[PDB]
Design a protein around this ligand. Structure first.
Ligand SMILES: *[C@@H]1O[C@H](CO)[C@@H](O[C@@H]2O[C@H](CO)[C@@H](O[C@@H]3O[C@H](CO[C@H]4O[C@H](CO)[C@@H](O)[C@H](O)[C@@H]4O)[C@@H](O)[C@H](O[C@H]4O[C@H](CO)[C@@H](O)[C@H](O)[C@@H]4O)[C@@H]3O)[C@H](O)[C@H]2NC(C)=O)[C@H](O)[C@H]1NC(C)=O
Ligand SMILES: *[C@@H]1O[C@H](CO)[C@@H](O[C@@H]2O[C@H](CO)[C@@H](O)[C@H](O)[C@H]2NC(C)=O)[C@H](O)[C@H]1NC(C)=O
Ligand SMILES: *[C@@H]1O[C@H](CO)[C@@H](O)[C@H](O)[C@H]1NC(C)=O
Ligand SMILES: *[C@H]1O[C@@H](C(=O)O)[C@@H](O)[C@H](O)[C@H]1F
Ligand SMILES: [Cl-]
Length: 595
């Protein structure tokens, strides 16, 4: 019996916040051409789809009393150029200087370093920007990952106070949280539990005042291949914090490594394709629907981060927990690195289209109501018109996902009944579909026979599988109703996008950049910040040598790899948006390129 998915576009229940717009990684590097490409891919997720990059060991990018900030400046500029913020973990020894946080002198020095770096980047980017940064404590303090630094219980509290008093010294507007660990039942996790007691009831290292600032509480909970287990584990912890620390009952909780399975480098076939993509979407749906959908317990859960910005290595280009697939092509003159968009990265661009209010939704099978704790589920959103640039939007994201297990033979029959769409001018809809047969770069890589150093043409075919299957805009049926009975694969993802026609056309594409890969091969990347409407069909790219359109299958990801047969890449490039009504926006500033 089929699954019935019902959506009411007239019932905007509560706000829908995009709490999942984060990623992260750990160095083994951060300034290599590889990472430059990686963060361009991350940054290219449309409509600020990924906003934060939680990066380990940022204070090893500073050397030593004065400090050389050159490398840290490097990484942060790279983030800033890709429209990304750092998950700023105050993590490092400043290249050997710091060794003991029970040494009074060093605690004071840590405070002054924190103030220096904070003030430096406030000066570099503006306070309006640096306030948004989630400054965080050292990663997993209960997991002994300190190198040559002695971090005892007392030392951790001293360290935190230096962190907090240092950031305050820069500006009181700066945000700081922690501990960024798992919070196991005591006597376990003593520095995680110790921190909250310290902030709640302890005395500041510097002021002697009772209690210390703690702007958010971050935990790490993974699901060991189960999706709903993540959410189940968070509730146990959140509720324990609520009862043990009453002052933190409203304190935001982050899970800033909420991954399906611990151990990023462990090769997993499901990490390669839509199996991973759909599970991430399922996890997010579970968190919205079974935690933030005006529940009677309503914990202040504010951030979820899939820690998947790592670069993959040989011989597992797809099988690791990464957003991109890396190919180091060692047999060209000279050796060069290529990246492919994994289905999970494309999934983040689909989650990106969800707007500011959740609509009423219900999944049922033969009259039995099913919540997101099932193989099939939905997220739905509505948008309130802002200016003449945008209109009313509906985003309906349906997943089929059995967690880390895929089912190639199964065809999940789904019937979608959309109702109560507020009437308006030019009501059209567009579908975008993803599965392992149609949209798996990995699977194409395998049809090609697993080429270790893929040729240009092999990459072209491999990239063809990146984007979802899109259907051209069709007018909405009368009465603001739409019924569709698609057959879904397992895993699969389906976005239905219903848009009303805005008064003005799309805005101007901005911050266009050209990035070299190898001979006759280049990455074009851009920003959609001034386009000011999510109802977009494709981005038109034009090339002039002394302007003709570059013909390509429709895509709304803010990154394109230009690899023509001729090899003629030298010239000028311009880019503009094209909406669902074929109305073009103004072309971006031309970007010159020579080889
Ligand atoms: C084309 O050329 C590039 C260089 O430009 C080669 O890239 C190297 O590829 C190998 C992978 O095959 C890399 O070596 C592997 O690195 C992994 C990560 O290492 C870091 O992290 C660990 C733990 O945190 C540290 O021990 C280590 O010091 C690093 O900081 C390791 O996990 C791997 O070890 C595992 O696999 C090997 C098999 O090779 C086993 O022997 C081990 O027991 C273990 O299970 C591994 O060492 C290497 O880092 C890459 N270098 C660069 C610069 O990227 C490509 O390999 C080459 N292409 C081909 C086809 O040869
Ligand atoms: C999500 O669903 C799973 C299974 O559908 C639930 O796990 C079951 O819970 C009951 C009651 O606690 C146990 O007796 C069973 O052993 C569990 N079944 C299986 C197959 O593991 C789980 O409790 C649900 N969680 C939420 C948050 O809805
Ligand atoms: C800091 O270090 C960088 C890279 O190691 C080096 O090139 C530079 O000379 C140093 N800068 C200053 C201002 O000392
Ligand atoms: C949390 O867990 C690690 C892992 O799963 O391998 C990584 O995601 C991160 O470095 C760590 F913070
Ligand atoms: Cl994982």
């Amino acid at each position: 019996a089929p699954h019935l998915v019902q959506v009411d576009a007239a019932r905007a229940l509560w706000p829908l916040r995009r709490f999942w717009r984060s990623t992260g990684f750990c160095p083994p590097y951060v300034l290599s051409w590889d990472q430059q490409l990686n963060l361009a891919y991350v940054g290219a997720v449309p409509h600020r789809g990924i906003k934060q990059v939680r990066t380990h060991w940022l204070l090893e990018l500073v050397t030593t009393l004065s400090y050389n900030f050159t490398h840290l400046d490097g990484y942060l500029d790279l983030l800033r150029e890709n429209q990304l913020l750092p998950g700023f973990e105050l993590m490092g020894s400043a290249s050997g200087h710091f060794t003991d946080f029970e040494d009074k002198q060093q605690v004071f020095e840590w405070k002054d370093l924190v103030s220096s770096l904070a003030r430096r980047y406030i000066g570099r980017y503006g306070l309006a920007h640096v306030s948004k940064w989630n400054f965080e404590t050292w990663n997993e303090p209960d997991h002994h990952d300190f190198d040559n630094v002695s971090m005892t219980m007392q030392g951790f509290l001293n360290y935190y106070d230096a962190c907090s008093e240092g950031l305050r010294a820069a500006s009181p507007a700066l945000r700081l949280g922690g501990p960024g660990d798992s919070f196991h039942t005591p006597p376990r996790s003593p520095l995680s539990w110790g921190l909250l007691r310290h902030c709640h009831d302890g005395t500041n290292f510097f002021t002697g005042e009772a209690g210390v600032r703690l702007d958010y509480i971050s935990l790490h909970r993974k699901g060991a291949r189960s999706s709903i287990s993540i959410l189940e584990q968070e509730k146990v912890v959140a509720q324990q914090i609520r009862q043990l620390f009453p002052k933190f009952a409203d304190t935001p909780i982050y899970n800033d490594e909420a991954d399906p399975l611990v151990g990023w480098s462990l090769p997993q076939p499901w990490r390669a394709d839509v199996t991973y993509a759909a599970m991430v979407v399922k996890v997010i749906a579970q968190h919205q629907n079974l935690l933030l959908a005006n529940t009677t317990s309503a914990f202040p859960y504010a951030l979820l981060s899939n820690d998947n910005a790592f670069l993959s290595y040989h011989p597992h280009p797809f099988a690791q927990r990464t957003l991109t697939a890396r190919f180091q092509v060692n047999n060209t003159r000279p050796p060069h690195v290529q990246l492919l968009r994994k289905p999970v990265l494309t999934a983040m661009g689909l989650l990106a289209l969800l707007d500011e209010e959740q609509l009423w939704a219900e999944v049922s099978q033969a009259g039995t109501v099913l919540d997101s704790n099932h193989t099939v589920g939905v997220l739905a959103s509505a948008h309130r018109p802002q200016g003449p640039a945008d209109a009313w939007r509906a985003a309906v994201l349906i997943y089929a996902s059995d967690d880390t297990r895929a089912h190639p033979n199964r065809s999940v029959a789904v019937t979608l009944r959309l109702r109560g769409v507020p009437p308006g001018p030019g009501l059209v809809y567009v579908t975008r579909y993803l599965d392992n047969g149609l949209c798996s770069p990995d699977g194409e890589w395998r049809r090609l026979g697993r080429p270790v150093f893929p040729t240009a043409e092999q990459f072209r075919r491999m990239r063809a599988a990146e984007d979802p299957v899109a259907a051209a805009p069709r007018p909405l049926p009368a009465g603001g109703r739409l019924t569709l009975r698609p057959a879904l694969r397992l895993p699969s993802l389906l976005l239905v996008h219903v848009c009303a026609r805005p008064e003005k056309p799309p805005g101007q594409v901005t911050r266009l950049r050209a990035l070299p890969l190898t001979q006759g091969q280049l990455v074009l990347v851009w920003s959609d910040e001034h386009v000011g409407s999510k109802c977009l069909w494709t981005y038109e790219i034009q090339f002039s040598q002394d302007y003709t359109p570059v013909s390509r299958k429709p895509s709304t990801f803010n990154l394109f790899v230009f690899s023509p047969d001729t090899g003629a890449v030298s010239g000028s490039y311009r880019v503009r948006a094209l909406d669902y009504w074929a109305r073009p926006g103004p072309f971006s500033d031309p970007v010159p390129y020579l080889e």
